[model samples]
Target chain A: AYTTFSQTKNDQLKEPMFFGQPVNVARYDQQKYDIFEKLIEKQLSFFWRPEEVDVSRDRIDYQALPEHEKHIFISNLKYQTLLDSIQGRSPNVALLPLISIPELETWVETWAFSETIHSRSYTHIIRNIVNDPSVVFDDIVTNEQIQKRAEGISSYYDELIEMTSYWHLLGEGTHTVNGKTVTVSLRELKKKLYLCLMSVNALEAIRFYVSFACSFAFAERELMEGNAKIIRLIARDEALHLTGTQHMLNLLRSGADDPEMAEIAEECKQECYDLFVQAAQQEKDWADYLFRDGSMIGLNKDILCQYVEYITNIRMQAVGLDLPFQTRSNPIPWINTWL
Target chain B: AYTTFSQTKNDQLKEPMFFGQPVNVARYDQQKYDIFEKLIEKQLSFFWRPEEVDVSRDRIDYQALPEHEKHIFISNLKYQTLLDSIQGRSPNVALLPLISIPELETWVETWAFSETIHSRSYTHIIRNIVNDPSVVFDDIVTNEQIQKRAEGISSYYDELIEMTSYWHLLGEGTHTVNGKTVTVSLRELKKKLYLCLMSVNALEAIRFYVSFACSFAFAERELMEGNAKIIRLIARDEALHLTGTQHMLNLLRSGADDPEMAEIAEECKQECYDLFVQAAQQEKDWADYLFRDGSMIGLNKDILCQYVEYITNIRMQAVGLDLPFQTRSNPIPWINTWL
Candidate 1:
């Protein structure tokens, strides 16, 4: 059975990153991986409140935008809100229970807490630009365009959480629950966690950067710069987040932490590639939706899709996955200045 | 089934605090209860890192301490490590899945993250003071006196997490698992959660304050003031944590958020009182263990016990529970200055 505080006294330095003894003591005096500790420290150093960035001018900038450009900006803002709404809570719900190392456990909490700050930033942005924020907030669920992406993004975390619940309830075995046969396998759960991390990396690395381009593009036109300032801070935090997931995936694949995880990572190589490609495809589709009526000054569907393909190839290669898209130059090089 | 992001589009203001449609949109433009939002804002405003405080001078002070006083100091530090070790993870594990409102969900994560900072401060203090920090950390798990308290403290969280797993998996019915009949009930689960919150409140309100007395005692003598500087910050954050749990408990008892939770709170009144009393007694027993060697300049077993009774009475009344101890003046009035 899983425990919040496992009383079994064991050397935490000898534990795996996950699926070992539950961490009894959250001691930073030592770590199986110091990168997580460094990440936690760096993240703490980057902490900023949403209200600290003055968005007063953003309301005026938003009012002056044309109708089509308004569609591009508001839809893009809503998409960012959806991504953060999931990011804020998903990592803690799906990851905290299984982590065995103290540093990684704390890192997961810090990473998720930072996302909540980003979520708050969106609320701050939306409230400044619109008198009724509900129109934007409510559409996050009712809009089919946004709902399509939400389903794909949340499914991985949902499956991992459900399988984890079953594993914790019945342990690793086939069991009968109300006349239904349910099989719980540790290896299968590990695979689910691996694919979920890949999906999360894609969200942080690709989906978020795609939205960052739109936010920064508006600022390039000397509009909505207040919102841009907040997103810049959010982008800085996401860079750390993407790096954290990249390390977890790479370490798991290297077989240094858990031999079985390495084998699992090898077996799921093709599926992992497909997951990243699918996320890129989703982002490309979202670009089309964001610019359906018209295009912004510096970003559009074709250019954003090219940028998606460009970044997807780079991020996929970071975690030992084969490139799934053709090579290309930076579609929106100005995005770098903000990041 | 539980999910990281529920796709259901509902009016968030009408939803209860827990067990409503799982908050799909993490919007903070409005809140069902603003206290959690205020708490989140307050906690963010209080963001800090342990390394910000210099504990270098405490190394000499720790080295000059008598053996028994060192025993008192180190043992108290270990108890704190144990408490935070559980706290830094348990709230997120146990409460995230069950929370229905976004403000409270973020508050829980922010609360847990701050505890991690507290956990780090202990390592900072311990490493600066002792060459072999493991000797102090290692004893936390092996010491019988500490383990006695660990078992009592973690049981509430462990039980709530276990039942939560079953509730998420099987969900409110009798089911056979490997030929063993296991029953899960929502009402019973609600009662478990109510009692769990009461226990958590007692931990943050009473158990932690008792440990803080020991930390501040060393500083009261003008020794280890660096460690006390860090702990004063921790105590300030803990005050927010205790207030958070207190509001959750009081709101549940008020029946404004969930009528069923109010009923459960009423049903568990005696159990809640007993849980608080049991925690107080545990702290008193721990006081005896701390001063078993000898007394410090301003604290002893009897005085610490009286402080426990003093705090238990005050915290219980805050949540509308009958006082478990006799009414009396504050035993350690000087502790107020640090707070």
Candidate 2:
């Protein structure tokens, strides 16, 4: 359905960001969108290794923690692991086939690769504190609280991926398969791309930040400081990723790359807003789960929920979505110190 | 048909390298293949930005070159751009959906991301030497000589990608589409994966090293020293990537992960041998193209063709294929100093 490299010699600058000819030659001498080239450079400048962080003391820190506090810390790391695991693979699987320009295509690959490093960081942290990390790692897929949110996050990517296959195989027309006619159109495919990017923006913006609050809360108490040091590096990388998705959404909505994408973005405004709110709600629910046994010293369910609402509104607005919650000051201003 | 993250809850340690179950969670607590994790760590530790390399003096050196020398240098850089363009995107697009283990999946992403840096380095080198990099960049797709090899190199990736989509969508069964019968089978897919990995091994081991010979030859004369510094970094990264593919091919051939892959590897031995020979012949043809105008002081077509034969023999034997050429020492021993 897709070719890894196209033979046709097309001007990369004239191609749309999506659904254009596949990028044939990997050249970075010029770009249709310089912002992507700049992002690639900036992201490279931010290259780091998780092993550099000293997580040695986290073992002793974990041993001293109460059962409830230990529950809070381990669960938060699991959620971060889930988020990075998906982000590490999804951008390339779902987006690489559609990329038409060299700069954005490379940007997507670089962005996804950094997420893998974050995944490794979690291992570094988990392996240091827990005697048997298999229990913690295995529980990620079986844990109901984590899987509940994963469904909503993965569905948008899965739907986009499935529809993308049909579009690429059948093109924009009706095809007969097993004596049944199925219609596929570029317009329908474009809508799916729009919603998928919106969902991704919410994922990087809302879903990750809520988990970050959980990590920093422990750091605020000077407990598990080694784990917090690693998350600090992850937070820096994630800010760049959040900018990447936001730019893609804004550029499409502005009609700079594809005219039809602007209209699709307009068409999906309400749906986009709903996606953000649903993610926010999931985070709040997860907050209750994280503190179910008991609340920690610096973070409680109520405070974490407030921060989710506050960050969700700002992130949604960055992409031109209407704010879903009332704007308020940062619920946990001290968390910024760790970030 | 494929998922961004599988929900099967299968044991990642028991999964094969490819086409077992899509990786559900990204965990590094333990690895079925520790080499991949070590490769990931090695690659992250070797990360270097292209912008850090100053190629300013190379512009002056390039401007003073004889017309024939300029022709040889520009064409070589174009070929490097073409190779990176494919390498930067192909691994992730063609392999992400089928990877069944976390460490290999992350290794693939990490390996591809480093190629993007090499792509950016070309733009950095090209822009510094020429006023309009657009002309050099544009020639990569339109240049008849470079386009010739790109087809052979890219076809392996393109074929594997197209077949993977079919396997994912149709599963291992026959189906009717518009009254035409199409069959998809796991055994057939496994054969494709084996051969494709062989083709990729030839790429990093043979195709890339041939291009590096051209870059380092210029540095042997103390000309374009800055460009060589950057390529030195690229060569180090490519070594890890070459080792990665070599280990992957050897592991599958040994029946360590999947017995069926062992049979497939044996079945494709003659085909794999022919692939390396074909790639070596192409590099010889590329050598002729490189010196079409005139030979440089330190390198020429005859020496380059000899180097191709020598390196192809070593690379093929590393994967258990018989040497394609007569045994010989390095034609250009000085290149090792730069490497």
Candidate 3:
């Protein structure tokens, strides 16, 4: 995370892997291919100045919520901190070393840094919403529902990173660590990476979609209009992140980016599907826990669970997964209006 | 680098060490100390939208340089690309997995990501300055003098990252890689990291200062003011970047961020001295090459080499090295007026 500027020369770059050899010069002259160039262009054109959105009204609405409704509001706010908290750092940490390509390396890191801004926005929103913000910030780890997510998330990244220890460490082959033997093959590692990105896709594409529904749900009730304004901005950024992940998945799935990765994607299909479904199931359980103290007016465990199943099927197919659960229907079709 | 944020949890993160653990969460609620936080704040505050600086006059000014002057302009630009190119990706790839502090981890990534934008800005500047920017970029690595520096810079990073790979994979022990036996010790790896950072300091501290002089020299002749304007903005950012590097070095020297690093800093002091001297010598050689065709009105091989020593001593002292050369005498003093 240290910084510097242009000086020139790139022979230091080796093999064109994600984080293989050092990136010598930051030149865009001739790319291995221009997809990332296009992605960076799309991202820059999608350049947004954060102040364009107005969140002033969110301040007043905070004063008006019922005590429990405040719980719903603050809790959702904390959940977002958790979401972006992982999003902001994970890609740079988990993906950078393995990345041999330049455009994707910059994109992944750029995408992650932008999420840090989003994470900062949560603090901005919370600071504006409540008087003592520590209560909200401290509970993210202590809250049972949120901690469940913290574990769910740290699992994939943690597991992949642990096995990936052998990737750059030994190049490729079987290796032993502390008396335990593990195979360290690029193909296996790419499979883990493919599944990790899928888990991430589910987190951003599916999981955030559910949480955004919750945040916007209150604003739909005329309860948190200002917070909704910020979420709208957040939603706009998420679309870009969603597209970034899609490009990553499609690159691997179609065997366009890395042929080995494409093979890995195929090998990871069922594991990827299981991960997405399990995360959805966890989200459903999270919804139940959020309402355990008492149900809110519009959202409850039953409807959110059905919505989870319905959206989970669509999300599964989005990644070319066949529907695993019986095809289901949305319990609260009207909720789409909030989004 | 192992390419993960944190592989271990609840380990005294405040107890800093390089290659110790992957930073798991990107939380800033607490830092072991705040030099990195300060770096983040300074970098964020230094951010400017590139378009804010007008480069229009410089485009007209660009048309007026003599052929050798034009060569000076474009070649320096291409060189800028190489420095930024390695810089933009190196820290995140090489230093991040081993970074123990969250702020330092994020700073490393942030620092690298910002360089990509600088990389883009060069494309913007070069595209504006010349009819065809293709050859200018093509020569970045192809140019022999620049390639010399590129190899020097990348070798240090590669050695450090390779050792980090062994340490993370094998975890402090004797290891065999492809039938060659090598020992991976924490202290040994930390020594490599210290020297790597010192080598990086030479890159930022002396090398970039020389390049900036080349850039500003053109503008001093009243040519390429637009490009010069952009360089001014870049200079401001580098001021912050160099400050960050200096802080990291100072923190290590002071035994504040990590005690082991401080001891390593002292142990490597002589090596650091030799590294700095070697880099200064390279820049001097590069100066002779830059002026080989013909000397510019204000900058020449002899004067630029003198300035290298002049700047080197100041930079060396900032991180506590003894005077390896003369005092802060800019051979081209009026050059400061232009900046």
Candidate 4:
């Protein structure tokens, strides 16, 4: 049983590749991992209560929307739900067991907490714009396109979790469970961990960026201004979060953590390379689905695809992934205008 | 190898407890448990940065104190460090692995994060009041009294962690490693948890009160009011923290989370009871040391001991434990002025 607040043994917190030994202390005096400290600093600096932002204007904007515009707005909200749906729960589940440092462990929790607040903000934003909040929430589980994306993200988390169970329950060895001889190894577990980091990077780096463009598109036309305000705050926080994921990716690949991960990074570079490209591709595909028949005022599927390629380059570079896409500038520079 | 962040799939978050297959996603949409949610809410609401309180006036207050009074002040600071020193790391190390739910997992981290801030505050308070901060910090490592308590707390966590590592690394049974008979049992590990929670509650509830009486002692004479101001804020946060511990104890004892814990509570009842009384006894002994040469004008060892029993009863009963001693009102009524 985990208490909300456990006693922190800040002094003896040993650094782990991710899950090595448990952290003994919560100390800023020293850090097993510094990247989390930086993320905490950035997140705290970007702290905002939903009350700090005024979303009053969006209430009226919703009343004047065309049915299709409403579909785009509400549909995007539903998709965002699924995004945070996966984003908020996975880190604590996947990372906490493995974290061996106080700062990083705390950062993972802090990171997850803020995302819930962000998820809440979206709910609040949607509730303000629509009379029924249930429909927005309910549609999340039912929407075909959104459900598909949810599966994609959940699959990665699921695979890691499945492997982790064996690792935790049986440890690293050959175990004949129910007449099946399964060999579990730390090296194999480390590979799962490395891939897990890459998948998270794609989620934060590619998926969220694509969705933000849509949210900003509405705000560009002076619509859903309140939603935009909250998203801006969320975006600033996301910047810190993406930085967290990026740090983990870089740290693991450098073999600064588990030396064996250097080999995993080398072996999985091509596969890890595909995780990003596939995510970017899926995001482009999701964009087409977001604007199936027509486009919003500024955000169109084609432009978003180009922006996907543009952002894909930057995000991939951040993770030390080679740039595969052709040269291109951002498609929707105007989207940054509202931001 | 654990990344502070991982790229695992975000989907399979609903796996079993700690040995859960794996958690690749970082979603907070839904939790497998709810206790962490309550704790996180308490923590988020309890958020108070050290810089928010103005402690500049405390520097001059320290200058006016006599040597013995300064001794009282510095000793309390050292004890606070020791409390947080163990606290800042213990939870992440001892409990992070056993976590079943994502929210509870993060709550542990958030809780630790706040303590780090609390630890930092002690340094901030010490740096403001004591001209030479390093001497006080240095003394903490060398001071026998604080070191003794530090080791006491750390040993429990250390043992729990070692047992857990062995349990996870090698299945429970007799194993001869270095010619030592090794037996790892879930029951023994649990006894460690129950004791750990009780120990933490003692630090949060009893130990903090002793320090509070000292802090409020100055404010009783209207000296160091700014320090009192900050301590009051700390007290408010500690109120939540100690209460969080109280809830954890109650939940564990009552089987609110796991049925096995109730039996553990029954098995460890007297032991848990002693955990509280011993912590209170330690506080009483500390009071004797704090006022060894001479009593402060407002706070004496005898009175502090009385306050100890007063709070000890209240704290124990908060979680349904009966106190051996009869309940009594606080010895120094003026202490409420700080709270």
Candidate 5:
């Protein structure tokens, strides 16, 4: 039953990426997929502490901003914080128990650990900009606009975690849990994992890019450049993170790792499309909230919404899903410099 | 129901360390306990990649060793590989879902991530010393001597994770799973958690230190210095990790963070003592295996066993547990130079 160190000695190379064996020894001498190993090395090399970037100047820049600009900046920071708060822990919680490969297992932990740095970066930025960081951190839970997105983002992870616990606890079969008939199917759980990765891919690819645009937009005015510098570091790390997930999704669909996963990926094609579309629409709604008071100089609700559609189409196509949004160029190409 | 991001807005400082509101927002501006934040900062500062340490010269050193010395060194390395393989993933799997403090949550991730680096260091050392690294890694699960310790080490984490799944899925109640009666109580689960922490503390404080002693034993003769350099780095990081678990155990026993945990810790006091003694004995038996072929110059089975007892007493007293063995000074005082 799911021991932390599986005692049964097995060839990890022969195992599937997940749902085969629980990865007994974390030997990196070989890998079923070397991409994960490469990603781990690249991620390790990319490590940076948030405190290294000087956000001391941000306090001055923040205090000088107009009320609406403050609203836009703080709101964007809060959203970024919320996304990372979820990202930091969710992958390890939902994915580690099910992973069967050593490289992927380490990659998942590395990926999640990097997000913690991002979370701390928000804390670093927030503490420097405001006298009381609580005012901003406290609002994250009560803010309806952020909470609306939080629910959407956390739902997939929550569902997959629950289903995974059931599968691990009771194996694959219909079982009664507390007088409720719960069916635990490996195939079904694999689908849940697939869709969850899609949602997470959207998070890393689309949502974070949207927030990065906001952070860099302020720097376009030569304001909050310190925070921008930190975001540039975070963006470099997120590029690796998104690449990791995109590879997981594409590899699953290719049927090379697990044939059953390919079938599940094919079956969930439309649902995955709808998930990306829903995330993009939520980002648009969030744009409305970010600029509710007024629009900034270079970024407005219309432009941010267009950027969301642009990124959504690109990210969806990467995972072999049908693109839902019309084709468009990046609304804010200058953000590419920061990325 | 457990969500990756708990939506509830609660005062994080007021919440207990575990089983609270699941740490909705990852804010470090404040903490229930600041030690975890301090530990995270210290751990981040201690980060070092395995590749940075040059192990190439170790190939010549390893090839020139006597057959028995080769067996002792490689066995010690294999045992180390097993310990880190479990450590790399177990803390996040067994602890993250229950962690309620943001500082501690991030610390756990950082702690586990560092262990992955240790695991990678094993791969780095093994590849340099052996013709085929698999010949060493593959034996980790098959070696009867090592498997005995693997079972003892992984049991606590496995029990905690299984019960945790039930507690999270069905809440605290009597339930039937697959026609078997099962009961999940929050208090009982907390006791399981306390005992698990004790076992983990034994692992970090006792099992790992024993392995470090062997690693340092080789360098005492000016042999395998590159491998010794990496182990020195690992030992430095493990110092922070043991400090982390020590704080977690001490805080729980103090009843300052969670009064309920204090009661659980008290109820499991004898069990904790036994767990530590059991771990100590297992190390002694592992010493027999490591020296079965022949003892190295600086270390032997009897000396290692005495060192284990000495450390067991010191570590036991740190968390207020009764010493299970006679008190003695460190047998290998020169090891402190490496530490």
Candidate 6:
């Protein structure tokens, strides 16, 4: 059932977005959704190497930062690294098996692979700024602030991947594993996917954009412009990623791709709303954590919190979810120039 | 058991290539295998877009061809698309869960993403040359000749994926599934991964290169230069993919990381020898099928068979596997120019 090539002669365009027949042949000659194919093209056209971005000057700039400002900068950088580290691997592991269409399957892999380049840029920026890179890399899993933020971010993906393993291996039935009953259902899986996309949307749309503001704030003072340049490139890629998940969520909810998914989307609307709200709240808390030591020149806890609300309202509305936060203008409109 | 972010702080360099702690952080600050990082860097540096290549004249050239010649050209394109279609999705699905280190995980994703670009080129080429691109893409799944080759190519990935599901779920214990007893063994799973990598190596090293010969042969005759130009980029990327797998296989066999993998590699020597031989045989049969209608000028059944043997030996020898064919120089020496 989980075979890579299913040996079926099914029409690819007839398949749903997920949990249909595993795509047998990769073909772009046609697509169920042209947005995915367009994203693939747009992402490829946006190909970049982290090494091409020069971060050699960040070390000198970092050495001159005030201790609290350094706290704000490195913690944001650490959070950015954590987000991409999960992102670079999770989509492929969680989404690749269930994808039933060629364009979307390839788009998921391409979107994930590009995040690895983002992951690498973190290394490039971290290595140049810090004398010992291990400390920065090590705290990603151990730092309670970083670990706490990653909790909600990876939960939906991890849950979906585990149930998918059972569904793929044992199919939809009651299975006794170690004397425990585990039921795998297609409907539940669809709900997981819909919610996961919303979670991912929140990540790319709100979480990453918040971190980018912090990076650009240093450059606002004309300090760490090298790091800011790299962040700017990452922000461009994240824009496409956020759009991709938004489109996936929108398509699923419209009852066009999968009627069951549309039902599941409706069923999970409140949970999805909570997911966005929780993520927004988490980012705000992260803002407090980042600035607990003190604040930088052009960014701080209050401004970042307001920006999170501004972005969350826009993102939630994109997928037709009710806005979780009050609509507000961008608090840091100048950061738009860097983005 | 499968987590997006493993909370435990383990040294990434200490993990094996597979079946260790799933990669928690996408860090390139260091690597247990520098070759993977190098491959990642080289692959990103070679980023390309298919739209950047002009394939318009190929439509005209394809239209001018006789029916048999069109059959050969279009069939070769179909097979290329099929292989990439599988290559694009399988690596992430089959490999991502088992991967242990950040660099290699990212490399696998990076490698898989590039194949999607190759997949896109097929669509671009097919849409330009054919009235309905659906005819070519639909045939890839149903066509007996293409499906036959896919069996050998996809079986290794399929087998690996299924076993991985069991391993991740049951964790090295015999389990009753639907009233049937199934034994899950890590040792057995590791062997599946070893052979899977060997098969993937043959795909990039032997299978794709064989397709490249047919593609370049047309351009050698100064026809379909646009198609050849796109394939030239594909070949350059394939060269890096081949290197990545070769390094993985070599590293595992050397026991520099995992002693169990070294044993598995040694234990699977006869199986691997037969695997390459089987792939070469299937490819040779494919050559026969391609030329059944008619032979092209530079590439015919016999010459293509020799190229298969030549590539098989070179690729097999790279991973320290026994050469399955007689040693020989490249049969299509002129094809190197297009490559």
Please give the distance, in angstroms, between residue B104's alpha carbon in candidate 2 and its true position after superposition. Answer: 0.5
Q: Is the docking of candidate 1 incorrect, acceptable, medium or high quality?
A: high
DockQ of each: 0.83, 0.75, 0.32, 0.14, 0.82, 0.75
The better candidate by DockQ, 5 or 6, is: 5
Better of 1 and 6 by DockQ: 1
Alpha-carbon DockQ of candidate 1: 0.83
Alpha carbon deviation, residue A259, candidate 4 (Å) = 5.2
Using all chains and alpha carbons, the TM-scores for the candidates as numbered come to: 0.99, 0.98, 0.87, 0.77, 0.98, 0.97
Error of 6 at B2 (Å): 1.4
Q: After superposition, how far is residue A71 of candidate 6 from its true place, in Å?
A: 0.2
Listed for every candidate in order, the interface RMSD values in angstroms are 1.0, 1.3, 5.3, 8.2, 1.1, 1.3
Question: Model 5, chain A: how large is the TM-score?
Answer: 0.98
For residues B198-258, write the lDDT of model 5, one tens digit per residue. 8888888889899889888889999999999999999998889889899999999999888
**Clashing residue pairs for model 5:** none
Better of 2 and 4 by TM-score: 2
Error of 6 at A49 (Å): 2.4
How well does candidate 1 score on lDDT at residue A62? 91
Ranking by TM-score: 1, 5, 2, 6, 3, 4
Q: What is the C-alpha lDDT of each candidate?
A: 0.90, 0.87, 0.72, 0.71, 0.90, 0.87
> Worst ten-residue run, lDDT, model 5 chain B?
B321-330
Tens-place lDDT per residue, model 2, A1-339, is: 577768787888899999999988777777898888887888888877887899889899898999988888899889999999999999999999999998899999989998998998898888889899988888888898889988777888988988888777667888887778878889889998888898888888888888888888878888888888888888888888888898999999999989999998888778878878888998898888888789977789889999999999899889876778887889889988977
Docking class of 5: high
Chain B global fold similarity (TM-score) for predicted model 5 against the true chain B: 0.98
Candidate 4, residues B227-304, lDDT tens digits: the string is 787778778777767866777777677775666778888988888887777777777788878887797887888788
lDDT per residue for candidate 3 within B84-201, as digits (tens), equals 8778778776776677666777677668777877787787787676777766776776777778787778878878866665676567777665555778888787788888788888
Model 6 agreement with the true structure over A235-282: per-residue lDDT tens digits: 999999998998888888898999988888888878888888888898
Query: Clashing residue pairs, candidate 2?
Result: A26-B85
Chain B of candidate 3 achieves a TM-score of 0.92
